[PDB]
Design an enzyme around this catalytic site. Sequence first.
Site, mmCIF file in Angstrom:
data_model
loop_
_atom_site.group_PDB
_atom_site.id
_atom_site.type_symbol
_atom_site.label_atom_id
_atom_site.label_comp_id
_atom_site.label_asym_id
_atom_site.label_seq_id
_atom_site.Cartn_x
_atom_site.Cartn_y
_atom_site.Cartn_z
ATOM 1 N N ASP A 242 0.862 -1.162 0.000
ATOM 2 C CA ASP A 242 0.000 0.000 0.000
ATOM 3 C C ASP A 242 0.901 1.214 0.000
ATOM 4 O O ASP A 242 2.093 1.109 0.303
ATOM 5 C CB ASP A 242 -0.865 0.030 1.274
ATOM 6 C CG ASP A 242 -2.115 -0.842 1.185
ATOM 7 O OD1 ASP A 242 -3.044 -0.579 1.986
ATOM 8 O OD2 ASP A 242 -2.188 -1.785 0.340
ATOM 9 N N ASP B 90 -6.592 -4.582 8.648
ATOM 10 C CA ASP B 90 -5.288 -4.427 8.062
ATOM 11 C C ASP B 90 -4.169 -4.546 9.120
ATOM 12 O O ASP B 90 -4.199 -3.902 10.169
ATOM 13 C CB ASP B 90 -5.203 -3.096 7.330
ATOM 14 C CG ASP B 90 -5.812 -3.154 5.914
ATOM 15 O OD1 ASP B 90 -6.062 -4.258 5.355
ATOM 16 O OD2 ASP B 90 -6.040 -2.063 5.353
#
Lengths: 133, 140, 132, 132, 140, 133
Positions: free
Chosen positions: A82, A111
Site C-alpha cells: 500500500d 489491516d
Amino acid sequence: PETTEAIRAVEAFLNALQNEDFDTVDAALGDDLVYENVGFSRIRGGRRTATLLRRMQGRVGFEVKIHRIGADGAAVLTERTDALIIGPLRVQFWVCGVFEVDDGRITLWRDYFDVYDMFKGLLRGLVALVVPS
Amino acid sequence: ETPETTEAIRAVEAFLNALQNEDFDTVDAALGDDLVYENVGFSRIRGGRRTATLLRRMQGRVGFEVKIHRIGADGAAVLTERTDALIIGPLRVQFWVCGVFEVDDGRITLWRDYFDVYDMFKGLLRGLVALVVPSLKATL
Amino acid sequence: ETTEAIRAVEAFLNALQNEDFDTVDAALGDDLVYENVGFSRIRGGRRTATLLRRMQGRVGFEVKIHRIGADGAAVLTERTDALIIGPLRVQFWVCGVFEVDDGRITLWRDYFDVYDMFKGLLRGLVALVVPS
Amino acid sequence: ETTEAIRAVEAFLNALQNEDFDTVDAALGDDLVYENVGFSRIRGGRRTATLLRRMQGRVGFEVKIHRIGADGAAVLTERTDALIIGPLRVQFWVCGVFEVDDGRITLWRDYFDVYDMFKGLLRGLVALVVPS
Amino acid sequence: ETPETTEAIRAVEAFLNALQNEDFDTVDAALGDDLVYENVGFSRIRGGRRTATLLRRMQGRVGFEVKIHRIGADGAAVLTERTDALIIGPLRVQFWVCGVFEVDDGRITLWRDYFDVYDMFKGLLRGLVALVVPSLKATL
Amino acid sequence: PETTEAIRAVEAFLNALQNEDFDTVDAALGDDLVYENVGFSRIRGGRRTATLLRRMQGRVGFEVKIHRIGADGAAVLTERTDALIIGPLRVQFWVCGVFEVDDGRITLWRDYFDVYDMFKGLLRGLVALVVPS
Ligand SMILES: [Ca+2]
Ligand SMILES: [Ca+2]
Ligand SMILES: [Ca+2]
Ligand SMILES: [Ca+2]
C-alpha cells in the site's frame, strides 16, 4: 461461486479506494462494518467509515497492489503493498488484510502492518522529497 | 481429483503443526530444497535443509505455538492469519503473524512471515510481566 | 414447498457423496447451524462448506437415503452413511433432520449411535485384513 | 393420507404416554415389526401391545415430538423420550420411523444413542440425590 | 391406576422366577397364608408357610426350571402355559405344565399345576437316556 | 377391544362345539388352523378339522365347561372340564386349551390333558354304565 464472489468484492473495494470511486466504496461496505488497523484504530459502521474515506480525497491518495489473495469461506486474505500519498510525499509499506464478506458487503476489514516497515517507508518518502530519486 | 488448492493448504497446516509439535522429520519432508524463508524486514535464509536443521536445533531452547485463525489459497500460494508464540523457559512471547507460502508438489518453496515490532514489543512486555505475575500470561 | 425442501436435501446429500462442492456451497444457508448430536456444533454455511471442501482426498462420504419426509420447512431422513479414509470404510446409520428456507439449508442435524459407529469401525478394521 | 399417517403416529405416541392401552392396541397392525435399533426386534402388534400394557405401573413413558414429517406411508419423528422407573427418570433423544397402512402402524423403528442414554442415566441417578 | 390384572400376572411371574432362582424370601412373601397347592391328581397341600418351607427344603436336592410360553388373567385368576424341568443331579426331567393361580392382594391363594403322566414318563426316559448320551438332554 | 374379541371367539367356538352348531364351527376356524391334542394328534387346516368334527355328530357328543379364560395378546388360555359322550358312556376329564386367534378366526387350537385323568374318567364312565350312579 460464493468464494469467487467474496474475492471480487474485496478486489473491487480496494481498487475503488485506489481509484477514488467513492460510490463503489459506499456500496461495498456493510452497515455493521468493523474496520481495524491492528494495534492502532478501530471504527464501527460502514457509513461512518465510507464518509471518513470520502472526506480524505484531495488530501491523501491511496495506492494498493494485491500480490496474493485467497478465500476461506466468507473470509478473504490479502498480501499487499500500500502507499499513502500526501502531496509530493509518498509512504509505502506492506499490508496483509483480512476481510469478511456477507452478501457482497464487507463486514470486517482488518489491516496488519509493521511500524518499523512504515517508519522506513516514511524515511524513504522524506529522502525522495529532496532526492526525487 | 482433489485440487492443488486443498493440497497446498493442507501442506502448510501440516508444516505449522509439525513445528509446534517438534515433529522434525515432517518439517524435513515439508521444506523444498530451494526454500526461501523470510521474516519480513529481519531475516532471509535460503535452502530447505539449512532451515530444517536450524529449526531442529532449536528444540529444547525455544518452543513454538501456532494458532491459525484463517487460511486460504491462490493457486500454489497459501495465506495465513495466525497468532504465534515463542517460549523460552518460563518466558512466553505472543504476537500476530501473517504468513504467505508457496507450495510446489507438496513441498514449501516460499515461507514468508509478516509481523509488527510494536505488537512484538507489547508481547515481550506482557511475557516479562507474566514472569512475575503468572496470571497475566498470554494463552492460545 | 414440501417437495422443494425434500429435493434440496437430496441434492445436497448427493452433492456431498459426489464431491460436488460448488453445489454443497449453493445448498447451505449463511446462518446454517450444523450439529452432529452430542459431538459437534458449527455455525455458518460458508465455514461448514469450506470445512467439507477441505476434507476432499482425505475422507470420502457415502449416503444412502432409505426414507425422507417433510413437514413444512422441516425434512427428516433415515440413512446409511459411510466415512472412507483410504482403505478403511466405516458404515453406520444416521437420522438427519434439516430445515430449509428458500432452497437453502439453515439447519442440518445428524443423529447417530456411538455403539453402532463403534461396530462399524470394528467391521471396517476387520475388512482391512479380510476384504470381504 | 399423509396427514392421516401423521395423526395415527401422534395419537399412538400420546396414547403410550397417557397409558391409554386400548388406543395403543387399536393403533398397532397385526404384522407390526417393532425395533429398537441395535437392541430389540419384536414381531406382531398384539404381542407388542400386551408387552407395553404389562409394563404399566413399573415403567412410565414420556414422549415429546419436536418435528414430524411424512413421505407417503412413511412417518419420521424427531423426539425426546423418557423412561420412568419410580423416582428414576432417564431422558434421551429418539428418532422414530414408522410405516402406517390403513390407520394401523406396521413398522415402528426407534433410533437412539447409547452414549446419550448413558448420560441420561447419570443425570437421572444424580437427580435421585440432588432433585433438581 | 394400574389394573389388578397386570398386578396378578406380575405376581405369578415373580413367583415362578423366584422358584427357579431359589429366591426363597420372595417365595415366602408371594404365598398367601391359606394357599391351596395342587398338582392335579397327585397332591394337595394347604398353607403358604408349609408349602414355602417344603420348597425351601428342596434346595440342593431338586432344582426347578420354568419357561412360561403364554400367561393371561381373568380378574384375580392367572393362567399359564409352561415347560417345567426338575433337576436331580445330572438327571433332568422336562415336561409341559399348565398352571392356574389365584392372587389376592399380591399374594397367591391358589396354585394348581396340570400335567400328563405320559408326557412326564417320556420326559423321564429322555432324562435317563441323556444320562448316558449327554447329547440328548432337554433344554429350555 | 382385540383381547375381548379373541376371548369371545374362543367361547363362541367351544359353545358351538358343545351345541352342534357346525356352521359357527366352520366360521370360527382359520384356513391354516393347526389343531393339536398334545402328545396325541395333529391336524392342519380349518376345513379338514371342521368337517371332521361335523362328521362326528350323532356318534360322539361334546360338553365343555370353561372355569377360567384369559388372553395374552392374540393367544387365549382356558381351564376346562370336557366330556366325550358315546351313547350312554360319558367320559369326563380336565383340559387346558391354548388358542391363537387372528381376525376373529382360530389359527391354533391346542388341548392339553392327562392320560391318567382320562383313564380314571373312562373307568368312572364304564362303572356308571352299570350303576347309573
Ligand atoms: Ca488513484
Ligand atoms: Ca450470501
Ligand atoms: Ca350338546
Ligand atoms: Ca386383527
